[PDB]
Each structure stands twice: as C-alpha cells, then as structure tokens.
Amino acid sequence: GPGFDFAQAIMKKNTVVARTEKGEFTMLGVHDRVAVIPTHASVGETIYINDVETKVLDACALRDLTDTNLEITIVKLDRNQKFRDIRHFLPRYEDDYNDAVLSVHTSKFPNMYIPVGQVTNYGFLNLGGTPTHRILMYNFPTRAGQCGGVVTTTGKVIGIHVGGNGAQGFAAMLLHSYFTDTQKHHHH
Amino acid sequence: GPGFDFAQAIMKKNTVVARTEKGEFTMLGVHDRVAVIPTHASVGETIYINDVETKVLDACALRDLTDTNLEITIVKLDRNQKFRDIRHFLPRYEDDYNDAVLSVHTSKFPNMYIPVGQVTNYGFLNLGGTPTHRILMYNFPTRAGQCGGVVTTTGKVIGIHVGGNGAQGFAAMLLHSYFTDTQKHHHH
Ligand SMILES: *[C@@H](CC(=O)OCC)[C@H](C[C@@H]1CCNC1=O)NC(=O)[C@H](Cc1ccccc1)NC(=O)[C@H](CCC(=O)OC(C)(C)C)NC(=O)OCc1ccccc1
Ligand SMILES: *[C@@H](CC(=O)OCC)[C@H](C[C@@H]1CCNC1=O)NC(=O)[C@H](Cc1ccccc1)NC(=O)[C@H](CCC(=O)OC(C)(C)C)NC(=O)OCc1ccccc1
C-alpha cells in the first residue's frame, strides 16, 4: 500500500506554506533553516512563510554541469525554528519508485495526500519552455496549486512537484548530495 | 493515525464521478446499483457516471420527520456493474468520531485524501439558506469541488461532504437504516 503515514510525518514536521510574487507553494524544510522551492517560484530577498514575511538569506537555483535547469532552489531562511533534519531520508542516486504519495500544504489545501502510483526517472522535460533535467514522472493528472508538493515513498523523500501536462505530473529530484555541509566558493 | 488504507479501499471499489446540471460530485455506491449524492446536486432522470450518461431509475431526497432536509439523495442507477455491498460499514446511530478522512474522486481530483481530524455530531445547519439536520462537522477548510466526498474512520463510512464556511466542513450523516431492504409505499 502507499506510505501515507510516512507522508503525513514529513508534512507535519517539515512543510510550510511559502508565498512569492508567483503565488503559494508547498515548501519542504530539509535541515536547520534550509528548505526547497521550485525555481519558477522566483524567490526574491524576502518570502512569506505561513503568512509571515521572512528574509531569504540565501537562494541557490540548481543547475547541472550542462548548465541546465534542475528546477530546485535551495533557500536559507531567517526564522527561529530549525527544521527536523530529514537528509537521511533523501535518496543517494537517481531511481524509479513504486506507489508514491504526493502531499500538498497550501492555504487552499492545508494537508492533502494523492497516491500517484509508479514514479519513473524521466530525464529531460521542456518545462513551460525551459529545458529541465533530472525529472521524475507519474501518471496522474496533477494541477496548478500542487507545485512544491512533496513526493515520498516509505522512508524516502524523492522530489518536489513542479509540472504537469494534464495527464502526467513531474517532480524535480531531490538527492542527498544537494545538502551535504560543504565548501568555500563565491556563488552569486 | 488516520485510517488511510480503509479510505482507499472504499474509494477504489465504491466511488464513481457523478455529474449533474450542477457540476461534478464524488459519488458513493452503497450496494447493488444504489448510490448517494448530495440533494443540492439536483439529480434528474439521467446522470453522468464516469462520463457515461446513465438513467436514474429512482431518486429519494431524504427528509426527517420534521420535514427537514437531510441533504442525502439515494439514487438507483441503470448500470451493469453492482457495487460491493458496504452497508455493514455504515454506523447504526448518530455519533462523534476521531481522526476522520475525507476522500474525493472527481475529474479534477481522481483520488485525494484529507485528514479532517475530529468529527462532531453538529445537528442543525443553515446550508446555503436551506435548514438541514443530522450534520457532522470537522474543523477543516473544505472547498468547492469536495461535495460528495466520503468521510470515513477505520471500519466506518460515516457521511458525505455537503458544505463548508471557510473554516469548518460539514457532512450529511449516513446511517445503516437508510439502506435496509424494506416496504410497500407510493413515494413520488
Ligand atoms: C505548479 C505552479 C503553478 O501552479 O503556477 C504558478 C505560476 C504547476 C503545476 C502544473 C500546472 C498544471 N499541472 C501541474 O501539475 N507547474 C507549472 O505550471 C509549470 C511552471 C511552473 C513551475 C514551478 C513554479 C511556477 C511555475 N508549468 C507547467 O507545468 C506546464 C503547464 C502550465 C499549464 O498549463 O497550467 C495551467 C494551470 C495554466 C493550465 N506544463 C508543462 O510544461 O508540461 C510539459 C510539456 C512538454 C511539452 C509540451 C507541453 C507540455
Ligand atoms: C459542494 C458543492 C459545490 O461545490 O457547489 C456546486 C453548486 C460545496 C462544498 C462547500 C463550498 C465551500 N466549501 C465547502 O466545503 N457545498 C456547497 O456549496 C453548499 C451548497 C451545495 C451542497 C451540495 C451540492 C450543491 C450545493 N453550500 C455551502 O456550503 C455554503 C457556502 C457556499 C460558498 O460560499 O461557496 C463558494 C465556493 C461559492 C465560495 N456554506 C454554508 O452554507 O455554510 C453554513 C453557513 C451558516 C451560516 C452562515 C454562513 C454559512
């Protein structure tokens, strides 16, 4: 069966509602004050988190070595609460998955769970005109309002929802090495 | 925890998408070719079931002995498939419930699950200007599109969603005695 209990534990402790100039997105907090949001949310230097204006201390829009959009933006937030560290539930490698759940936490849908079935490592996607890599696909008719929704199986947080064509939905992958405590590098 | 597995088994075997002049509603099939839909769906002599036009052989809009709306309409459909008989999961009596799930099956949301928390026997509701009785209430911001959504706990199908005021949601109760094989009576 789908891992609804795991999905709910992730939603309860690790999601907030984020709101940018582009609208509301489910937001997964990963560790400390670090979270993710789809790049097309257009994060600026402030963002609303559960309707509280919040400084964005850092925002890194991920791209691969072909200089192609991965659609994941990692943000560091000026907030008091730390997120539960869920890096150990992130997969190490690209993979296909069985019986996944997509979970949403927005003003409109404060906690909703959608079994999306099998998830395949899809690869290239033309996402609203932007070439994008490392995409996961599920055969489910996902909708506007679900961007940032968290995709899980039991024990794994595998991606966040970023797109759909009316019949299929698409998530950007989350990989463990995106969040490892790292180096010294001018990035802006 | 919420009974997601029970909710999913009910959705899988016992729901269809119904569409009337008023729009789409999740539809719970109860037994044989008998199903329910909110009275305010305005069922006529035909209805679309999973987009197939279907004769409504009977429609009974339930009212209590005070001649007040209960908001449940029981329909008998001209279809080949029988519904799995789930009358044994219907409660005998009015009651309050813990940790319920609201499940939706529409074109827009083909299977989505919302934990709504505690459900209380609420009683009277002015529902869009119509006095209505036997209402269940949950503190969840339910939305248009969710009418007919099935409310369960484990082992019990307790109501269908009919209304909301922006902060709370409301279901019409389902009781076991609504569906017992019965009498001889001119009802139209
Ligand atoms: C979430 C963000 C959102 O709702 O918009 C705020 C501006 C969207 C989820 C999608 C939309 C439809 N169903 C879904 O699952 N994602 C998008 O809209 C993305 C762009 C985006 C991503 C993240 C943040 C902000 C914006 N674009 C698409 O998914 C695009 C379809 C857009 C669309 O039709 O939306 C409506 C609601 C206006 C109808 N789909 C897409 O590119 O699919 C791939 C494709 C390849 C080739 C040909 C056609 C499509
Ligand atoms: C499901 C049916 C639907 O979407 O409309 C098709 C015509 C609705 C679910 C509600 C709507 C808002 N959130 C929900 O959970 N139900 C209704 O709209 C019902 C009427 C109804 C029922 C069944 C079938 C068809 C129609 N009406 C209400 O719930 C009403 C609010 C209507 C409303 O504001 O909807 C929008 C989307 C246009 C904003 N709520 C209500 O009566 O609450 C009790 C109340 C008591 C005292 C004062 C104010 C409210």
Side-chain angles (χ1 to χ4, degrees):
Chain A
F4 292 110
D5 293 329
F6 180 73
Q8 192 171 34
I10 296 298
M11 298 305 288
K12 188 194 196 192
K13 278 156 128 55
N14 285 82
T15 59
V16 299
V17 186
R19 171 170 38 99
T20 68
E21 54 171 53
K22 298 302 197 224
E24 284 199 340
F25 298 83
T26 290
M27 169 173 278
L28 177 75
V30 178
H31 71 99
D32 294 296
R33 290 144 185 118
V34 171
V36 294
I37 191 156
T39 298
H40 281 73
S42 297
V43 186
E45 54 185 30
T46 63
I47 197 175
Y48 293 83
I49 302 293
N50 296 340
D51 303 304
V52 176
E53 195 184 41
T54 302
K55 272 183 206 299
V56 177
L57 300 174
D58 203 2
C60 306
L62 300 188
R63 308 178 74 79
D64 62 21
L65 270 287
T66 69
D67 192 28
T68 303
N69 186 42
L70 302 170
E71 190 63 17
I72 292 302
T73 288
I74 299 176
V75 303
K76 179 178 176 177
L77 300 170
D78 185 10
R79 306 182 78 230
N80 186 225
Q81 316 87 315
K82 283 187 208 189
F83 299 118
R84 195 219 345 198
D85 184 350
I86 50 154
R87 286 174 290 191
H88 68 102
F89 295 123
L90 303 166
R92 173 129 47 102
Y93 295 122
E94 303 184 347
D95 206 356
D96 293 323
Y97 298 86
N98 297 312
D99 212 16
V101 181
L102 166 64
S103 315
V104 173
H105 181 355
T106 64
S107 291
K108 256 138 192 152
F109 294 101
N111 275 338
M112 126 172 127
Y113 301 86
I114 305 166
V116 296
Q118 304 306 95
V119 172
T120 62
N121 176 1
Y122 189 83
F124 171 84
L125 183 69
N126 186 0
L127 178 64
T130 310
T132 303
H133 287 162
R134 235 171 274 168
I135 290 293
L136 297 161
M137 177 280 283
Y138 19 99
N139 288 297
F140 193 89
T142 54
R143 317 291 183 196
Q146 296 164 2
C147 279
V150 186
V151 188
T152 56
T153 54
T154 309
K156 303 265 191 267
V157 176
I158 68 162
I160 64 175
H161 183 79
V162 300
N165 62 17
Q168 305 171 306
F170 299 105
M173 274 185 222
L174 290 167
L175 295 170
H176 181 267
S177 72
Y178 294 170
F179 302 96
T180 50
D181 303 325
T182 183
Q183 261 331 113
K184 293 181 170 202
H185 184 232
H186 176 71
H187 45 272
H188 302 298
Chain B
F4 292 110
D5 293 329
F6 180 73
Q8 192 171 34
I10 296 298
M11 298 305 288
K12 188 194 196 192
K13 278 156 128 55
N14 285 82
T15 59
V16 299
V17 186
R19 171 170 38 99
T20 68
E21 54 171 53
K22 298 302 197 224
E24 284 199 340
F25 298 83
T26 290
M27 169 173 278
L28 177 75
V30 178
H31 71 99
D32 294 296
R33 290 144 185 118
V34 171
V36 294
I37 191 156
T39 298
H40 281 73
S42 297
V43 186
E45 54 185 30
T46 63
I47 197 175
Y48 293 83
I49 302 293
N50 296 340
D51 303 304
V52 176
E53 195 184 41
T54 302
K55 272 183 206 299
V56 177
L57 300 174
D58 203 2
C60 306
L62 300 188
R63 308 178 74 79
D64 62 21
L65 270 287
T66 69
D67 192 29
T68 303
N69 186 42
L70 302 170
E71 190 63 17
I72 292 302
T73 288
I74 299 176
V75 303
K76 179 178 176 177
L77 300 170
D78 185 10
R79 306 182 78 230
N80 186 225
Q81 316 87 315
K82 283 187 208 189
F83 299 118
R84 195 219 345 198
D85 184 350
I86 50 154
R87 286 174 290 191
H88 68 102
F89 295 123
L90 303 166
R92 173 129 47 102
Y93 295 122
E94 303 184 347
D95 206 356
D96 293 323
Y97 298 86
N98 297 312
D99 212 16
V101 181
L102 166 64
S103 315
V104 173
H105 181 355
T106 64
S107 291
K108 256 138 192 152
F109 294 101
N111 275 338
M112 126 172 127
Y113 301 86
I114 305 166
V116 296
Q118 304 306 95
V119 172
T120 62
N121 176 1
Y122 189 83
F124 171 84
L125 183 69
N126 186 0
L127 178 64
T130 310
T132 303
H133 287 162
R134 235 171 274 168
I135 290 293
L136 297 161
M137 177 280 283
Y138 19 99
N139 288 297
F140 193 89
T142 54
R143 317 291 183 196
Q146 296 164 2
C147 279
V150 186
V151 188
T152 56
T153 54
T154 310
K156 303 265 191 267
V157 176
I158 68 162
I160 64 175
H161 183 79
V162 300
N165 62 17
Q168 305 171 306
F170 299 105
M173 274 185 222
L174 290 167
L175 295 170
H176 181 267
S177 72
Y178 294 170
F179 302 96
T180 50
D181 303 325
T182 183
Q183 261 331 113
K184 293 181 170 202
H185 184 232
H186 176 71
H187 45 272
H188 302 298

PDB file of all heavy atoms in Angstrom, chain A residues 75-101:
ATOM      1  N   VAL A  75      16.833  27.391  -0.365  1.00  0.00           N
ATOM      2  CA  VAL A  75      16.813  28.697   0.294  1.00  0.00           C
ATOM      3  C   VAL A  75      17.237  28.510   1.752  1.00  0.00           C
ATOM      4  O   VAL A  75      17.036  27.442   2.333  1.00  0.00           O
ATOM      5  CB  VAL A  75      15.432  29.394   0.168  1.00  0.00           C
ATOM      6  CG1 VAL A  75      15.051  29.543  -1.270  1.00  0.00           C
ATOM      7  CG2 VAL A  75      14.331  28.554   0.884  1.00  0.00           C
ATOM      8  N   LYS A  76      17.872  29.547   2.316  1.00  0.00           N
ATOM      9  CA  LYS A  76      18.186  29.599   3.722  1.00  0.00           C
ATOM     10  C   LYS A  76      17.365  30.749   4.279  1.00  0.00           C
ATOM     11  O   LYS A  76      17.335  31.864   3.688  1.00  0.00           O
ATOM     12  CB  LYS A  76      19.688  29.860   3.889  1.00  0.00           C
ATOM     13  CG  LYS A  76      20.189  29.970   5.341  1.00  0.00           C
ATOM     14  CD  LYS A  76      21.717  30.176   5.335  1.00  0.00           C
ATOM     15  CE  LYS A  76      22.271  30.401   6.718  1.00  0.00           C
ATOM     16  NZ  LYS A  76      23.784  30.531   6.646  1.00  0.00           N
ATOM     17  N   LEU A  77      16.685  30.500   5.394  1.00  0.00           N
ATOM     18  CA  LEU A  77      15.664  31.448   5.869  1.00  0.00           C
ATOM     19  C   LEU A  77      16.026  32.050   7.210  1.00  0.00           C
ATOM     20  O   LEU A  77      16.557  31.364   8.055  1.00  0.00           O
ATOM     21  CB  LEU A  77      14.315  30.718   6.020  1.00  0.00           C
ATOM     22  CG  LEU A  77      13.713  30.078   4.755  1.00  0.00           C
ATOM     23  CD1 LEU A  77      12.499  29.174   5.125  1.00  0.00           C
ATOM     24  CD2 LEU A  77      13.323  31.161   3.760  1.00  0.00           C
ATOM     25  N   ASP A  78      15.650  33.297   7.441  1.00  0.00           N
ATOM     26  CA  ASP A  78      15.846  33.870   8.755  1.00  0.00           C
ATOM     27  C   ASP A  78      14.592  33.600   9.627  1.00  0.00           C
ATOM     28  O   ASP A  78      13.683  34.432   9.638  1.00  0.00           O
ATOM     29  CB  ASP A  78      16.089  35.375   8.647  1.00  0.00           C
ATOM     30  CG  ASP A  78      16.417  36.022  10.006  1.00  0.00           C
ATOM     31  OD1 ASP A  78      16.653  35.318  11.042  1.00  0.00           O
ATOM     32  OD2 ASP A  78      16.479  37.265  10.006  1.00  0.00           O
ATOM     33  N   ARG A  79      14.586  32.477  10.354  1.00  0.00           N
ATOM     34  CA  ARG A  79      13.457  32.047  11.202  1.00  0.00           C
ATOM     35  C   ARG A  79      14.053  31.541  12.467  1.00  0.00           C
ATOM     36  O   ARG A  79      15.189  31.098  12.461  1.00  0.00           O
ATOM     37  CB  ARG A  79      12.717  30.835  10.603  1.00  0.00           C
ATOM     38  CG  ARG A  79      12.253  30.993   9.199  1.00  0.00           C
ATOM     39  CD  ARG A  79      11.493  29.737   8.740  1.00  0.00           C
ATOM     40  NE  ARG A  79      10.118  29.682   9.269  1.00  0.00           N
ATOM     41  CZ  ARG A  79       9.576  28.631   9.892  1.00  0.00           C
ATOM     42  NH1 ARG A  79      10.263  27.489  10.093  1.00  0.00           N
ATOM     43  NH2 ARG A  79       8.313  28.719  10.296  1.00  0.00           N
ATOM     44  N   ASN A  80      13.276  31.530  13.533  1.00  0.00           N
ATOM     45  CA  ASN A  80      13.708  30.958  14.785  1.00  0.00           C
ATOM     46  C   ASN A  80      13.751  29.424  14.813  1.00  0.00           C
ATOM     47  O   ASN A  80      14.753  28.846  15.218  1.00  0.00           O
ATOM     48  CB  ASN A  80      12.810  31.473  15.925  1.00  0.00           C
ATOM     49  CG  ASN A  80      13.297  31.031  17.278  1.00  0.00           C
ATOM     50  OD1 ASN A  80      12.497  30.590  18.105  1.00  0.00           O
ATOM     51  ND2 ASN A  80      14.619  31.097  17.513  1.00  0.00           N
ATOM     52  N   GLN A  81      12.652  28.777  14.432  1.00  0.00           N
ATOM     53  CA  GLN A  81      12.544  27.299  14.444  1.00  0.00           C
ATOM     54  C   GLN A  81      13.554  26.649  13.453  1.00  0.00           C
ATOM     55  O   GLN A  81      13.705  27.133  12.345  1.00  0.00           O
ATOM     56  CB  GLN A  81      11.123  26.861  14.019  1.00  0.00           C
ATOM     57  CG  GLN A  81       9.908  27.633  14.617  1.00  0.00           C
ATOM     58  CD  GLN A  81       9.500  28.905  13.811  1.00  0.00           C
ATOM     59  OE1 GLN A  81      10.353  29.737  13.392  1.00  0.00           O
ATOM     60  NE2 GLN A  81       8.178  29.065  13.620  1.00  0.00           N
ATOM     61  N   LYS A  82      14.242  25.586  13.872  1.00  0.00           N
ATOM     62  CA  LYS A  82      15.019  24.727  12.969  1.00  0.00           C
ATOM     63  C   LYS A  82      14.096  23.640  12.417  1.00  0.00           C
ATOM     64  O   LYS A  82      13.225  23.144  13.137  1.00  0.00           O
ATOM     65  CB  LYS A  82      16.147  24.006  13.705  1.00  0.00           C
ATOM     66  CG  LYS A  82      17.371  24.828  14.021  1.00  0.00           C
ATOM     67  CD  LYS A  82      18.477  23.930  14.597  1.00  0.00           C
ATOM     68  CE  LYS A  82      19.378  24.753  15.509  1.00  0.00           C
ATOM     69  NZ  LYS A  82      20.593  23.999  15.938  1.00  0.00           N
ATOM     70  N   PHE A  83      14.287  23.242  11.162  1.00  0.00           N
ATOM     71  CA  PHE A  83      13.594  22.042  10.663  1.00  0.00           C
ATOM     72  C   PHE A  83      14.234  20.767  11.218  1.00  0.00           C
ATOM     73  O   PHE A  83      15.465  20.690  11.353  1.00  0.00           O
ATOM     74  CB  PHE A  83      13.659  21.986   9.124  1.00  0.00           C
ATOM     75  CG  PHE A  83      12.992  23.149   8.443  1.00  0.00           C
ATOM     76  CD1 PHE A  83      13.729  24.013   7.654  1.00  0.00           C
ATOM     77  CD2 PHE A  83      11.612  23.353   8.554  1.00  0.00           C
ATOM     78  CE1 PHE A  83      13.130  25.074   6.993  1.00  0.00           C
ATOM     79  CE2 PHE A  83      10.984  24.415   7.891  1.00  0.00           C
ATOM     80  CZ  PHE A  83      11.736  25.279   7.112  1.00  0.00           C
ATOM     81  N   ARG A  84      13.411  19.766  11.536  1.00  0.00           N
ATOM     82  CA  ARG A  84      13.907  18.395  11.737  1.00  0.00           C
ATOM     83  C   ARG A  84      14.793  17.986  10.559  1.00  0.00           C
ATOM     84  O   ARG A  84      14.443  18.209   9.400  1.00  0.00           O
ATOM     85  CB  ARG A  84      12.757  17.382  11.819  1.00  0.00           C
ATOM     86  CG  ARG A  84      13.230  16.035  12.381  1.00  0.00           C
ATOM     87  CD  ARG A  84      12.642  14.774  11.747  1.00  0.00           C
ATOM     88  NE  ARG A  84      11.459  15.001  10.930  1.00  0.00           N
ATOM     89  CZ  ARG A  84      10.602  14.038  10.569  1.00  0.00           C
ATOM     90  NH1 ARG A  84      10.810  12.789  10.970  1.00  0.00           N
ATOM     91  NH2 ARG A  84       9.538  14.332   9.805  1.00  0.00           N
ATOM     92  N   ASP A  85      15.939  17.398  10.848  1.00  0.00           N
ATOM     93  CA  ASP A  85      16.893  17.136   9.777  1.00  0.00           C
ATOM     94  C   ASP A  85      16.412  15.869   9.106  1.00  0.00           C
ATOM     95  O   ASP A  85      16.406  14.832   9.723  1.00  0.00           O
ATOM     96  CB  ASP A  85      18.303  16.917  10.365  1.00  0.00           C
ATOM     97  CG  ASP A  85      19.367  16.728   9.289  1.00  0.00           C
ATOM     98  OD1 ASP A  85      19.041  16.573   8.100  1.00  0.00           O
ATOM     99  OD2 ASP A  85      20.558  16.782   9.640  1.00  0.00           O
ATOM    100  N   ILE A  86      15.996  15.953   7.856  1.00  0.00           N
ATOM    101  CA  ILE A  86      15.473  14.758   7.148  1.00  0.00           C
ATOM    102  C   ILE A  86      16.391  14.357   5.987  1.00  0.00           C
ATOM    103  O   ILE A  86      15.997  13.589   5.090  1.00  0.00           O
ATOM    104  CB  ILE A  86      14.029  14.965   6.627  1.00  0.00           C
ATOM    105  CG1 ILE A  86      13.928  16.276   5.856  1.00  0.00           C
ATOM    106  CG2 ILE A  86      12.989  14.946   7.793  1.00  0.00           C
ATOM    107  CD1 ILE A  86      12.785  16.285   4.798  1.00  0.00           C
ATOM    108  N   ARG A  87      17.638  14.837   6.021  1.00  0.00           N
ATOM    109  CA  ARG A  87      18.585  14.478   4.953  1.00  0.00           C
ATOM    110  C   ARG A  87      18.778  12.960   4.833  1.00  0.00           C
ATOM    111  O   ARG A  87      19.007  12.437   3.751  1.00  0.00           O
ATOM    112  CB  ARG A  87      19.942  15.183   5.173  1.00  0.00           C
ATOM    113  CG  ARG A  87      19.851  16.659   4.848  1.00  0.00           C
ATOM    114  CD  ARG A  87      21.147  17.387   5.202  1.00  0.00           C
ATOM    115  NE  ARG A  87      21.345  17.492   6.652  1.00  0.00           N
ATOM    116  CZ  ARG A  87      22.288  18.271   7.183  1.00  0.00           C
ATOM    117  NH1 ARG A  87      23.094  18.960   6.379  1.00  0.00           N
ATOM    118  NH2 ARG A  87      22.426  18.359   8.479  1.00  0.00           N
ATOM    119  N   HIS A  88      18.687  12.238   5.935  1.00  0.00           N
ATOM    120  CA  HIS A  88      18.859  10.789   5.844  1.00  0.00           C
ATOM    121  C   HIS A  88      17.706  10.077   5.080  1.00  0.00           C
ATOM    122  O   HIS A  88      17.840   8.915   4.718  1.00  0.00           O
ATOM    123  CB  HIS A  88      19.124  10.172   7.230  1.00  0.00           C
ATOM    124  CG  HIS A  88      17.944  10.230   8.158  1.00  0.00           C
ATOM    125  ND1 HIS A  88      17.132   9.138   8.408  1.00  0.00           N
ATOM    126  CD2 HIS A  88      17.433  11.254   8.898  1.00  0.00           C
ATOM    127  CE1 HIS A  88      16.187   9.482   9.270  1.00  0.00           C
ATOM    128  NE2 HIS A  88      16.340  10.759   9.577  1.00  0.00           N
ATOM    129  N   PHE A  89      16.599  10.769   4.796  1.00  0.00           N
ATOM    130  CA  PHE A  89      15.527  10.160   4.003  1.00  0.00           C
ATOM    131  C   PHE A  89      15.656  10.516   2.537  1.00  0.00           C
ATOM    132  O   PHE A  89      14.802  10.142   1.735  1.00  0.00           O
ATOM    133  CB  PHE A  89      14.130  10.627   4.464  1.00  0.00           C
ATOM    134  CG  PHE A  89      13.756  10.205   5.856  1.00  0.00           C
ATOM    135  CD1 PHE A  89      13.402  11.169   6.813  1.00  0.00           C
ATOM    136  CD2 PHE A  89      13.712   8.844   6.214  1.00  0.00           C
ATOM    137  CE1 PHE A  89      13.034  10.771   8.130  1.00  0.00           C
ATOM    138  CE2 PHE A  89      13.355   8.437   7.524  1.00  0.00           C
ATOM    139  CZ  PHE A  89      13.017   9.401   8.479  1.00  0.00           C
ATOM    140  N   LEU A  90      16.686  11.284   2.174  1.00  0.00           N
ATOM    141  CA  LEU A  90      16.875  11.622   0.756  1.00  0.00           C
ATOM    142  C   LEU A  90      17.644  10.515   0.043  1.00  0.00           C
ATOM    143  O   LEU A  90      18.633  10.014   0.584  1.00  0.00           O
ATOM    144  CB  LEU A  90      17.646  12.950   0.597  1.00  0.00           C
ATOM    145  CG  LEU A  90      17.010  14.183   1.287  1.00  0.00           C
ATOM    146  CD1 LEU A  90      18.029  15.358   1.368  1.00  0.00           C
ATOM    147  CD2 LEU A  90      15.738  14.604   0.503  1.00  0.00           C
ATOM    148  N   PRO A  91      17.193  10.124  -1.167  1.00  0.00           N
ATOM    149  CA  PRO A  91      17.923   9.084  -1.892  1.00  0.00           C
ATOM    150  C   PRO A  91      19.335   9.522  -2.303  1.00  0.00           C
ATOM    151  O   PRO A  91      19.587  10.707  -2.579  1.00  0.00           O
ATOM    152  CB  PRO A  91      17.092   8.843  -3.144  1.00  0.00           C
ATOM    153  CG  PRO A  91      16.157   9.904  -3.238  1.00  0.00           C
ATOM    154  CD  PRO A  91      16.013  10.590  -1.900  1.00  0.00           C
ATOM    155  N   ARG A  92      20.229   8.544  -2.398  1.00  0.00           N
ATOM    156  CA  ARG A  92      21.598   8.823  -2.807  1.00  0.00           C
ATOM    157  C   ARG A  92      21.700   9.041  -4.313  1.00  0.00           C
ATOM    158  O   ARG A  92      22.442   9.921  -4.782  1.00  0.00           O
ATOM    159  CB  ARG A  92      22.508   7.675  -2.305  1.00  0.00           C
ATOM    160  CG  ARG A  92      23.977   7.746  -2.801  1.00  0.00           C
ATOM    161  CD  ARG A  92      25.061   7.641  -1.703  1.00  0.00           C
ATOM    162  NE  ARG A  92      24.887   6.576  -0.717  1.00  0.00           N
ATOM    163  CZ  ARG A  92      25.553   5.416  -0.729  1.00  0.00           C
ATOM    164  NH1 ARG A  92      26.439   5.140  -1.689  1.00  0.00           N
ATOM    165  NH2 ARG A  92      25.319   4.508   0.216  1.00  0.00           N
ATOM    166  N   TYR A  93      20.927   8.269  -5.067  1.00  0.00           N
ATOM    167  CA  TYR A  93      21.028   8.163  -6.510  1.00  0.00           C
ATOM    168  C   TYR A  93      19.697   8.385  -7.187  1.00  0.00           C
ATOM    169  O   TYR A  93      18.649   8.242  -6.540  1.00  0.00           O
ATOM    170  CB  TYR A  93      21.548   6.748  -6.877  1.00  0.00           C
ATOM    171  CG  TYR A  93      22.970   6.481  -6.393  1.00  0.00           C
ATOM    172  CD1 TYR A  93      23.260   5.408  -5.545  1.00  0.00           C
ATOM    173  CD2 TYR A  93      24.009   7.339  -6.758  1.00  0.00           C
ATOM    174  CE1 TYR A  93      24.589   5.176  -5.091  1.00  0.00           C
ATOM    175  CE2 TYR A  93      25.326   7.121  -6.332  1.00  0.00           C
ATOM    176  CZ  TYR A  93      25.603   6.047  -5.509  1.00  0.00           C
ATOM    177  OH  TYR A  93      26.887   5.887  -5.103  1.00  0.00           O
ATOM    178  N   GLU A  94      19.719   8.713  -8.484  1.00  0.00           N
ATOM    179  CA  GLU A  94      18.539   8.626  -9.325  1.00  0.00           C
ATOM    180  C   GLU A  94      17.944   7.198  -9.256  1.00  0.00           C
ATOM    181  O   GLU A  94      18.679   6.204  -9.094  1.00  0.00           O
ATOM    182  CB  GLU A  94      18.876   8.946 -10.784  1.00  0.00           C
ATOM    183  CG  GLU A  94      19.536  10.333 -11.014  1.00  0.00           C
ATOM    184  CD  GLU A  94      19.746  10.620 -12.496  1.00  0.00           C
ATOM    185  OE1 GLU A  94      19.618   9.672 -13.300  1.00  0.00           O
ATOM    186  OE2 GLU A  94      19.997  11.790 -12.878  1.00  0.00           O
ATOM    187  N   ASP A  95      16.623   7.090  -9.397  1.00  0.00           N
ATOM    188  CA  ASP A  95      15.957   5.782  -9.281  1.00  0.00           C
ATOM    189  C   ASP A  95      14.494   5.896  -9.757  1.00  0.00           C
ATOM    190  O   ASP A  95      13.991   7.025  -9.996  1.00  0.00           O
ATOM    191  CB  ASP A  95      16.017   5.289  -7.832  1.00  0.00           C
ATOM    192  CG  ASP A  95      15.948   3.766  -7.703  1.00  0.00           C
ATOM    193  OD1 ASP A  95      15.769   3.074  -8.734  1.00  0.00           O
ATOM    194  OD2 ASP A  95      16.115   3.269  -6.567  1.00  0.00           O
ATOM    195  N   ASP A  96      13.843   4.724  -9.939  1.00  0.00           N
ATOM    196  CA  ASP A  96      12.415   4.612 -10.195  1.00  0.00           C
ATOM    197  C   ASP A  96      11.810   4.177  -8.867  1.00  0.00           C
ATOM    198  O   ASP A  96      12.501   3.552  -8.043  1.00  0.00           O
ATOM    199  CB  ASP A  96      12.081   3.509 -11.232  1.00  0.00           C
ATOM    200  CG  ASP A  96      12.588   3.811 -12.656  1.00  0.00           C
ATOM    201  OD1 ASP A  96      12.586   4.949 -13.143  1.00  0.00           O
ATOM    202  OD2 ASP A  96      12.984   2.846 -13.326  1.00  0.00           O
ATOM    203  N   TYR A  97      10.515   4.459  -8.664  1.00  0.00           N
ATOM    204  CA  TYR A  97       9.865   4.145  -7.373  1.00  0.00           C
ATOM    205  C   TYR A  97       8.465   3.579  -7.598  1.00  0.00           C
ATOM    206  O   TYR A  97       7.831   3.862  -8.615  1.00  0.00           O
ATOM    207  CB  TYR A  97       9.773   5.402  -6.456  1.00  0.00           C
ATOM    208  CG  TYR A  97      11.135   5.952  -6.106  1.00  0.00           C
ATOM    209  CD1 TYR A  97      11.778   6.852  -6.964  1.00  0.00           C
ATOM    210  CD2 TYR A  97      11.799   5.522  -4.963  1.00  0.00           C
ATOM    211  CE1 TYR A  97      13.077   7.361  -6.642  1.00  0.00           C
ATOM    212  CE2 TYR A  97      13.110   5.990  -4.652  1.00  0.00           C
ATOM    213  CZ  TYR A  97      13.719   6.909  -5.492  1.00  0.00           C
ATOM    214  OH  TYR A  97      14.996   7.373  -5.193  1.00  0.00           O
ATOM    215  N   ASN A  98       7.988   2.844  -6.597  1.00  0.00           N
ATOM    216  CA  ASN A  98       6.646   2.254  -6.601  1.00  0.00           C
ATOM    217  C   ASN A  98       5.707   3.014  -5.681  1.00  0.00           C
ATOM    218  O   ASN A  98       6.117   3.439  -4.604  1.00  0.00           O
ATOM    219  CB  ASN A  98       6.732   0.792  -6.099  1.00  0.00           C
ATOM    220  CG  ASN A  98       7.568  -0.079  -7.021  1.00  0.00           C
ATOM    221  OD1 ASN A  98       7.381  -0.053  -8.241  1.00  0.00           O
ATOM    222  ND2 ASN A  98       8.518  -0.825  -6.447  1.00  0.00           N
ATOM    223  N   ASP A  99       4.450   3.135  -6.091  1.00  0.00           N
ATOM    224  CA  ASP A  99       3.361   3.514  -5.180  1.00  0.00           C
ATOM    225  C   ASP A  99       3.667   4.785  -4.328  1.00  0.00           C
ATOM    226  O   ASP A  99       3.512   4.786  -3.095  1.00  0.00           O
ATOM    227  CB  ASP A  99       3.071   2.334  -4.265  1.00  0.00           C
ATOM    228  CG  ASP A  99       1.615   2.258  -3.869  1.00  0.00           C
ATOM    229  OD1 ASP A  99       0.755   2.929  -4.529  1.00  0.00           O
ATOM    230  OD2 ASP A  99       1.341   1.541  -2.870  1.00  0.00           O
ATOM    231  N   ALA A 100       4.050   5.866  -5.003  1.00  0.00           N
ATOM    232  CA  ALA A 100       4.414   7.110  -4.318  1.00  0.00           C
ATOM    233  C   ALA A 100       3.177   7.939  -3.909  1.00  0.00           C
ATOM    234  O   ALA A 100       2.095   7.799  -4.499  1.00  0.00           O
ATOM    235  CB  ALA A 100       5.344   7.956  -5.216  1.00  0.00           C
ATOM    236  N   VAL A 101       3.389   8.820  -2.930  1.00  0.00           N
ATOM    237  CA  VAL A 101       2.395   9.811  -2.481  1.00  0.00           C
ATOM    238  C   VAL A 101       2.912  11.232  -2.775  1.00  0.00           C
ATOM    239  O   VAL A 101       4.082  11.536  -2.531  1.00  0.00           O
ATOM    240  CB  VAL A 101       2.108   9.673  -0.963  1.00  0.00           C
ATOM    241  CG1 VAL A 101       1.035  10.694  -0.505  1.00  0.00           C
ATOM    242  CG2 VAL A 101       1.621   8.208  -0.608  1.00  0.00           C
TER     243      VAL A 101
END
